[PDB]
């Protein structure tokens, strides 16, 4: 199906405790494949998936160079942001950057991304046109002016339409055993009496990949959007994910409830019920 590549970056200042810590990770879809941590014993970008290990020493050298340079620009940027927001040097602040691309089943570019956040809030983002900017405030507008002057968007468009797509294609081929395999959820419903007149029905999805999934409870065919407790999809640690959806039902009415499961690993949506 469709695929994505993303590089995430986080620098966190710590005044009086040395220089900011820098951590960057790369993903293809929901698979971590590279990492770099500035606090590591001897910081290098490291592989985190088998299909990237075949890349030569030249690949790792170049990647590590970029990671180290990005740690440095983040340090400069954190200093710049203190100025832009008239902030003291006393506090810890956070700078985040994500960039990457989405491709369709045939490998064509769907969308490119390049965005920043400061202290957990939107800062500046490259628009979908890969040519214009959305700045969140007057500080971000200062960055926008600099980046428009330097024709940064044009550079990003070139990368996102070119190398991003091409290297994603390469990774998808090299990791075709895993990246191009969807694992369907293993599903079941559990029942737990709360009291004499109420019971919890919990619909489970386990062992699935990728993470995207929809779990919905129906009562007499009606979506129970507003009464369903839905946990955040969580990693099992073996590359697969887990999720559940729960409803509180009047006792004796269990069979009026159906759980519905949609996942790309499934040929068609599943319907299940509690099986006493």
């Amino acid at each position: 199906g469709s695929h994505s590549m993303r590089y995430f970056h986080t620098s966190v200042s710590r005044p009086g405790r040395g220089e900011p810590r820098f951590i960057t990770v790369g993903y293809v879809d929901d698979t971590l494949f590279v990492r770099f941590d500035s606090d590591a014993a001897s910081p290098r970008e490291e592989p985190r998936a088998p299909w990237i290990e075949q890349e030569g020493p030249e690949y790792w050298d170049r990647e590590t160079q970029i990671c180290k340079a990005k740690a440095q620009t983040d340090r400069e940027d954190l200093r710049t942001l203190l100025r832009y927001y008239n902030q003291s040097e006393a506090g810890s602040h956070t700078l985040q950057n994500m960039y990457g691309c989405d491709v369709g089943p045939d490998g064509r570019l769907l969308r490119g991304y390049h965005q920043h956040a400061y202290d957990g809030k939107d800062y500046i983002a490259l628009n979908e046109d890969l040519s214009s900017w959305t700045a969140a405030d007057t500080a971000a507008q200062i960055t926008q002016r600099k980046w428009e002057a330097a024709r940064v968007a044009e550079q990003l468009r070139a990368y996102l339409e070119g190398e991003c797509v091409e290297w994603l294609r390469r990774y998808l081929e090299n990791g075709k055993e895993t990246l191009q395999r969807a694992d369907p959820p293993k599903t079941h419903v559990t029942h737990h009496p709360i009291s004499d007149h109420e019971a919890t029905l919990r619909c489970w999805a386990l062992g699935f990949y990728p993470a995207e999934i929809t779990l919905t409870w129906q009562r007499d065919g009606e979506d129970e959007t507003q009464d369903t407790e839905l946990v955040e999809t969580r990693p099992a640690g073996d590359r697969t994910f887990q999720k559940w959806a729960a409803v509180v039902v009047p006792s004796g009415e269990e069979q009026r409830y159906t759980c519905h499961v949609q996942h790309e690993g499934l040929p068609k949506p599943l319907t299940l019920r509690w099986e006493p």
Binding site: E63, I66, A69, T73, L81, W147, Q155, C164
Partner: peptide
């Protein structure tokens, strides 16, 4: 692979 060129805000 990552974008080579540096960028500051």
């Amino acid at each position: 692979r990552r974008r080579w060129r540096r960028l500051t805000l």
